[PDB]
Scaffold this motif. Sequence first.
Motif, short mmCIF file in Angstrom:
data_model
loop_
_atom_site.label_atom_id
_atom_site.label_comp_id
_atom_site.label_asym_id
_atom_site.label_seq_id
_atom_site.Cartn_x
_atom_site.Cartn_y
_atom_site.Cartn_z
N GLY A 42 0.75 -1.27 0.11
CA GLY A 42 0.00 -0.15 0.00
C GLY A 42 0.79 1.43 0.04
N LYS A 43 2.09 1.14 -0.28
CA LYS A 43 2.76 2.23 -0.34
C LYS A 43 3.15 3.04 -1.72
N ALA A 44 3.26 4.27 -1.57
CA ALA A 44 3.38 5.09 -2.93
C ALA A 44 4.46 5.92 -2.94
N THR A 45 4.90 6.43 -3.98
CA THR A 45 5.68 7.68 -3.84
C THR A 45 5.85 8.31 -5.33
N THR A 46 6.63 9.37 -5.65
CA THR A 46 6.50 10.48 -6.66
C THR A 46 7.56 9.87 -7.74
N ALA A 47 7.49 10.34 -9.04
CA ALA A 47 8.40 10.29 -9.92
C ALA A 47 9.65 10.95 -9.67
N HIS A 48 9.59 12.03 -8.92
CA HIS A 48 10.78 12.85 -8.41
C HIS A 48 11.72 12.00 -7.54
N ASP A 49 10.92 11.10 -6.66
CA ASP A 49 11.53 10.22 -5.55
C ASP A 49 12.22 9.20 -6.49
N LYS A 105 -1.23 -0.10 -18.86
CA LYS A 105 -1.14 -1.67 -18.82
C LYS A 105 -1.78 -2.41 -17.61
N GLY A 106 -2.32 -1.46 -16.80
CA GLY A 106 -3.02 -1.68 -15.58
C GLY A 106 -2.09 -2.54 -14.36
N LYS A 107 -0.92 -2.08 -14.71
CA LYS A 107 0.06 -2.51 -13.69
C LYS A 107 0.57 -1.61 -12.25
N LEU A 108 0.22 -0.31 -12.55
CA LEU A 108 0.41 0.61 -11.51
C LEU A 108 -1.00 1.26 -11.53
N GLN A 109 -1.21 1.96 -10.25
CA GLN A 109 -2.22 2.92 -10.04
C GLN A 109 -1.57 4.22 -9.72
N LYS A 110 -2.33 5.15 -10.78
CA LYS A 110 -1.66 6.60 -10.25
C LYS A 110 -2.84 7.14 -9.42
N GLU A 111 -2.27 7.46 -8.42
CA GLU A 111 -3.17 8.45 -7.45
C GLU A 111 -3.55 9.83 -7.67
N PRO A 161 2.31 16.46 -6.43
CA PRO A 161 2.68 15.52 -7.45
C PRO A 161 2.01 14.30 -7.31
N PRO A 162 1.56 13.65 -8.58
CA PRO A 162 1.07 12.42 -8.49
C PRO A 162 1.92 11.13 -7.58
N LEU A 163 1.12 10.38 -7.14
CA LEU A 163 1.48 9.05 -6.49
C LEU A 163 1.44 8.01 -7.09
N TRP A 164 2.33 7.03 -7.16
CA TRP A 164 2.34 5.52 -7.99
C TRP A 164 2.59 4.90 -7.11
N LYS A 165 1.56 3.55 -7.17
CA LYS A 165 1.85 2.38 -6.32
C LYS A 165 1.37 1.08 -7.31
N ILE A 166 1.72 -0.10 -6.71
CA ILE A 166 1.36 -1.32 -7.71
C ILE A 166 -0.12 -1.56 -7.41
N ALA A 167 -0.63 -1.63 -8.54
CA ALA A 167 -2.11 -1.78 -8.61
C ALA A 167 -2.45 -3.09 -7.68
N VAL A 168 -3.69 -2.75 -7.44
CA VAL A 168 -4.43 -3.96 -6.64
C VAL A 168 -5.12 -4.76 -7.62
N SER A 169 -5.05 -6.14 -7.71
CA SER A 169 -5.37 -7.03 -8.79
C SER A 169 -6.38 -7.98 -8.32
N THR A 170 -7.26 -8.49 -9.33
CA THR A 170 -8.24 -9.45 -8.99
C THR A 170 -7.54 -10.88 -9.44
#
Lengths: 62, 63
Positions: free
Chosen positions: B15-22, B44-50, B54-63
């Motif tokens: 559930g952790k996210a960070t920035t492109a800058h980071d 591609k459905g592999k990441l979630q953009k919050e 700045p936008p935050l990015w994390k691994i997509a929650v999958s089914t």
Amino acid sequence: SHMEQRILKFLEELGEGKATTAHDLSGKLGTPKKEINRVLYSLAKKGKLQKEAGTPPLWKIA
Amino acid sequence: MEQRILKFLEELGEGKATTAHDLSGKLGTPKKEINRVLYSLAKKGKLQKEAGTPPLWKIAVST
RNA sequence: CGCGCG
RNA sequence: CGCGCG
Ligand code: NA
Ligand code: NA
Ligand code: NA
């Protein structure tokens, strides 16, 4: 500014009320569009040009 | 590289996210390149953009 | 696709 | 300031 003058002159050459795009200015003046746009947005802030927001935006003498 | 970003964001924790800058700093890669890869991974459905700046990015929650 | 961004 | 832009 050297570039400001080139852009303003290009526009004045077209006649009163005429508009052009950064795309066009870049080609005709032989200048990267990024630079053209930096100067277009600045001039607008200075009130020397009017931006007509669009896709792409159109620019005329203010 | 897509797989490099996916691994790093995986190791960041659940559930952790960070920035492109980071990511740019941590992977020694221009932000330009980082961002191109992030936006494509999201398509591609592999990441979630919050939402937000700045936008935050994390691994997509999958089914 | 609007992008000017340093 | 969000920028990913070919
Ligand atoms: Na981003
Ligand atoms: Na930018
Ligand atoms: Na652009």
